[PDB]
Amino acid sequence: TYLNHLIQGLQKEAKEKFKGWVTCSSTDNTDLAFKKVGDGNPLKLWKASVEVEAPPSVVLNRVLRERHLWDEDFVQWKVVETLDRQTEIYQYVLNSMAPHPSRDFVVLRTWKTDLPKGMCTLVSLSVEHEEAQLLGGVRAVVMDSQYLIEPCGSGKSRLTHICRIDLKGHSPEWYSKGFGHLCAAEVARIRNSFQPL
């Protein structure tokens, strides 16, 4: 047959050259984008944004201690160990939509509220703990996860989540674009949970 799609070849060629953020279409007023790390790992690094009607340190507490207020799937949670005033081992479970197993998490988080220019950050990465035993389905691997919250406007914040998770056992042809949408919706829910509703 005759149909040259060297086009789809030429895009895949220019993306390989590029090492920064590739933007996406995103619903419900969010900014999505991705990035190939050049890792030797197919998994993309994603970056979602929103403007949220609350000052940074509030938004930070909303992500850090109040996620039952914005995630209907967020089920079992416990601080597993406290390492210092601002770092800990946290363990939660997320329930899954279809008859799948649950995605499970055990993470080192540290957070920071006294950064220059009113900035706050929460950062996470998966670990194992001698006391955090499979609370259900499938251990994920938070390879990267970082919330950057910065002041924009009068008592409002720009919330940005850059992450890269390896849930263990779905298609690479699913984390190609579908995962990004899940990120943009997490960050939209956080926003919604500060709207009189």
Numbering used by the authors: 908 to 1104
Could you give the paper's own sentences about this structure?
Steroidogenic acute regulatory (StAR) protein related lipid transfer (START) domains are small globular modules that form a cavity where lipids and lipid hormones bind. The concave face of the β-sheet and the C-terminal α-helix enclose a hydrophobic cavity that can accommodate lipid molecules. Here we present crystal structures of four human START domains, those of STARD1, STARD5, STARD13 and STARD14/ACOT11.
Group 2 consist of proteins containing only a START domain; group 3 proteins are capable of binding different ligands, such as phosphatidyl choline (STARD2/PCTP) and ceramides (STARD11); group 4 proteins (DLC, or deleted in cancerous liver cells) are frequently de-regulated in cancer and contain Rho-GTPase activating domains; group 5 proteins contain two thioesterase domains; and group 6 consists of only STARD9, a 4614-residue protein with unknown function, that contains a kinesin motor domain at its N-terminus. Of particular interest in the scope of this paper are STARD13 and STARD14, the family members for which the ligands are not known. STARD13 Arg974/STARD14 Arg449144 is highly conserved and is likely a key residue binding negatively charged lipids such as phosphatidylcholine and fatty acids. All structures reported are relevant to disease. They are down- (STARD13) or up-regulated (STARD5) in cancers, mutations in them result in metabolic disorders (STARD1) or they are linked to obesity (STARD14;).
